Amino acid sequence: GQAFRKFLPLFDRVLVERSAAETVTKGGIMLPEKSQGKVLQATVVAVGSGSKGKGGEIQPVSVKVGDKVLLPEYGGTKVVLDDKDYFLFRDGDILGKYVD
Amino acid sequence: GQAFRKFLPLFDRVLVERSAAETVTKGGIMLPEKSQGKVLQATVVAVGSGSKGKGGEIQPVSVKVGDKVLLPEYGGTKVVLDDKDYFLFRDGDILGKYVD
Amino acid sequence: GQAFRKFLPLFDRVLVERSAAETVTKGGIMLPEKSQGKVLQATVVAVGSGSKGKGGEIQPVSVKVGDKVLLPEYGGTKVVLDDKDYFLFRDGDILGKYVD
Amino acid sequence: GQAFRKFLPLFDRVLVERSAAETVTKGGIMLPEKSQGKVLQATVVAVGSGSKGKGGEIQPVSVKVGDKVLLPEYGGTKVVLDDKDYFLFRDGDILGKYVD
Amino acid sequence: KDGKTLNDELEIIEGMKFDRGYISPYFINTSKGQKCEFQDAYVLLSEKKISSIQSIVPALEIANAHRKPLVIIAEDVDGEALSTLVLN
C-alpha cells in the first residue's frame, strides 16, 4: 500500500481529505460559518492494500492516490493526523471519480 | 465507461437526467408548479466501468448512454454538476428501458 | 426479451395486465364499483431479457407472452402506458401458470 | 410438472386440498362449526416443476400427487378453483408425509 | 325583519339565492360592487369536496373547449384545486 504521514490503512480502506469549504459567493456575499454544512468533495491521500472480501485472491483498491472523488453523505470515520482532520472511507462507498 | 462533464461513475452506478415536468395539460389548462411532484422518465448520460457484484470477472452495465429509462420512485442519489441536478442510480434499480 | 408498446422490461422483470373485474354475478345482480377490490387474474404482455441473479450464465424467464398467471396480492409495481394501466413483477413473484 | 383442474404451480410450489373438518366425536355429540378451526391434513393435487433456489440444475419436488402430508400451522397461500378452495405451499415447508 | 331607514321597504328575492360568497377574491371581474358576473355559464354541482387536481381538470377542459364560463358549487374547494383555479 501507500503510506501517508506515517499512516497506512488496512484492507481496502481509503483515506481522503475534504476540500476547503466555500465562504464567498460568486459575487461579494460572505457566508456564515454555521451554514456551509459538510462538503462532499475530497481528495485521496492514502490507499489500502486490497479487498479481503473477494474469494481467493484479494483485489486492489480501484482509486489511485491524487484523484478527486465525490463522497457519500452518511459514511466516513474521523482520523487526526498532525492535529488536522482526515476522513476514512471504504472502497465501495466512493460514489464517483472526477476526471481531467 | 463513459465520463460526462468531467464526472465518472464508479463500479456499476449509472447517472441519469430527469425529463421536464408537465405544466400544460393537453387542453389550455396549466398546472401548479408544486403539483408536478416527480417524473419517472430519465435519460442516461454516463455509465460506470463494471459490476463488482458478479463473482470472478466484473460484468459491464446493461444500459448504454442516450437511452430512455423508467426510474424507480424511491431510490437514487442527488448530485450537482454546474448547478444542474443529476441523479445516480444502481444498475439493478433501473426499472425498465424504452425502445424506438 | 420482447417489447410491448415501446417498452422492454430489464433483467427478469415481467410486465402483465390485470383482468377486468366482474360487475354482474351469475344472476341479475350488479355489484358496486368500490367492492370488487383487486383482481389477481392477469395476462403476460411483455417479458424481460434474462435472470441476473443466476450465477454465470443468465437463465431466461419461465413464462412467455400470452399466458395467464395468478399474481400475488401484495407485490407489483405501477407503470402507465398510453393512459392504460400495467403492472410489473419479478419472474419469481408469480404464483402459478394457467395451461390450455 | 402436473396440472390440476386447469392450473399449474410454478417452480417448486405444491398445491394441496385440506381434509374435511370433523363434526362428530367418537360419541354421539357433534361439534360446533365455529370451534373446529383449521385442520392440518391434506393431499397433494398438483406439483410444480423444480426448485429454483438450488444452484445449477433444478432438483424436482420431494412429494408426488396422491400423497398425504402434514402442513405447517402458519404458512400457506389461498387459491380458489371452480369455486373450491385450495392452498399453495412451498416444497420446503411440508412438515411430513404419511406412508401406507 | 328589522329595517335601517325611516320608511319600511318591500323587497323581492326571485330566482335562486342561497347566500354563499365566492371562496377567493381573485375571482372578481367587475370592479363596481365587487361582483362576479357571467352569462350563459355552466354549473358543476358536486355533493362531495373537490380537492384532487384529477377530479377538476376535465371540467375546465370542457369549459375551455366550449368557451363558456364555469361555476363550481360544492362542499368546499381544497388548497390544490383552489390554487389551480386561481392560477388559471
Swiss-Prot record, chains A, B, C, D:
Coiled-coil stretches noted in the UniProt entry, renumbered to this chain: none
Matches recorded under InterPro entries: Chaperonin_GroES (IPR020818), Chaperonin_GroES_sf (IPR037124), Chaprnonin_Cpn10_CS (IPR018369), GroES-like_sf (IPR011032)
Alphabetical list of CDD domains matching this protein: cpn10
Principal cellular location given in the protein's record: mitochondrion
Lineage of source species: Eukaryota, Metazoa, Chordata, Craniata, Vertebrata
Compartment(s) where it occurs, according to its Swiss-Prot or TrEMBL record: Mitochondrion matrix
Inducing factors: By stress.
Gene3D superfamilies the record matches: GroES chaperonin
GO molecular function terms attached to this record: ATP binding; metal ion binding; protein folding chaperone; protein-folding chaperone binding; RNA binding; unfolded protein binding
UniProt GO cellular component terms: extracellular exosome; membrane; mitochondrial matrix; mitochondrion
Name of the protein: 10 kDa heat shock protein, mitochondrial
PROSITE patterns documented for this protein: CHAPERONINS_CPN10
Swiss-Prot record, chain E:
Localization in the cell: Mitochondrion matrix
N6-succinyllysine PTM sites in chain numbering: K1, K4, K17, K35, K49
Paired cysteines (S-S): none
Coiled coil: none
Residues annotated with N6-acetyllysine modification: K1, K4, K17, K35, K48, K49, K68
Subunit-level organization: Homoheptamer arranged in a ring structure. The functional units of these chaperonins consist of heptameric rings of the large subunit Hsp60, which function as a back-to-back double ring. Interacts with 2 heptameric Hsp10 rings to form the symmetrical football complex. Interacts with HRAS. Interacts with ATAD3A. Interacts with ETFBKMT and EEF1AKMT3. Interacts with MFHAS1. (Microbial infection) Interacts with hepatitis B virus/HBV protein X.
Disorder cited: Spastic paraplegia 13, autosomal dominant: A form of spastic paraplegia, a neurodegenerative disorder characterized by a slow, gradual, progressive weakness and spasticity of the lower limbs. Rate of progression and the severity of symptoms are quite variable. Initial symptoms may include difficulty with balance, weakness and stiffness in the legs, muscle spasms, and dragging the toes when walking. In some forms of the disorder, bladder symptoms (such as incontinence) may appear, or the weakness and stiffness may spread to other parts of the body. Leukodystrophy, hypomyelinating, 4: A severe autosomal recessive hypomyelinating leukodystrophy. Clinically characterized by infantile-onset rotary nystagmus, progressive spastic paraplegia, neurologic regression, motor impairment, profound intellectual disability. Death usually occurs within the first two decades of life.
Its biological purpose: Chaperonin implicated in mitochondrial protein import and macromolecular assembly. Together with Hsp10, facilitates the correct folding of imported proteins. May also prevent misfolding and promote the refolding and proper assembly of unfolded polypeptides generated under stress conditions in the mitochondrial matrix. The functional units of these chaperonins consist of heptameric rings of the large subunit Hsp60, which function as a back-to-back double ring.
Similarity remark: Belongs to the chaperonin (HSP60) family.
Protein name (Swiss-Prot/TrEMBL): 60 kDa heat shock protein, mitochondrial
Organism expressing this protein natively: Homo sapiens (Human)
Lineage, highest ranks first: Eukaryota, Metazoa, Chordata, Craniata, Vertebrata
Gene responsible for this protein: HSPD1
